[PDB]
Amino acid sequence: GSKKPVPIIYCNRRTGKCQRM
């Protein structure tokens, strides 16, 4: 592929757990 669209990242550094938003 060439480029990959990404969603928003939602990381709660605090409880060090991230996901997408």
mmCIF file of C-alpha atoms in Angstrom:
data_model
loop_
_atom_site.group_PDB
_atom_site.id
_atom_site.type_symbol
_atom_site.label_atom_id
_atom_site.label_comp_id
_atom_site.label_asym_id
_atom_site.label_seq_id
_atom_site.Cartn_x
_atom_site.Cartn_y
_atom_site.Cartn_z
ATOM 1 C CA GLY A 1 0.000 0.000 0.000
ATOM 2 C CA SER A 2 1.226 3.643 0.034
ATOM 3 C CA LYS A 3 -0.402 5.739 2.784
ATOM 4 C CA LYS A 4 -2.656 4.500 5.635
ATOM 5 C CA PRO A 5 -5.347 6.846 7.060
ATOM 6 C CA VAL A 6 -5.323 6.663 10.871
ATOM 7 C CA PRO A 7 -8.058 7.505 13.449
ATOM 8 C CA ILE A 8 -7.320 9.660 16.513
ATOM 9 C CA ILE A 9 -5.269 8.126 19.273
ATOM 10 C CA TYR A 10 -6.561 8.340 22.726
ATOM 11 C CA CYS A 11 -3.909 7.496 25.254
ATOM 12 C CA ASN A 12 -4.335 7.868 28.993
ATOM 13 C CA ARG A 13 -0.648 7.998 29.707
ATOM 14 C CA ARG A 14 -1.748 8.242 33.352
ATOM 15 C CA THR A 15 -3.107 4.665 33.450
ATOM 16 C CA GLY A 16 -0.788 4.054 30.488
ATOM 17 C CA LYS A 17 -3.390 2.627 28.226
ATOM 18 C CA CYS A 18 -4.117 3.862 24.755
ATOM 19 C CA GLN A 19 -6.612 3.118 22.061
ATOM 20 C CA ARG A 20 -8.185 4.922 19.133
ATOM 21 C CA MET A 21 -10.882 7.580 19.084
#
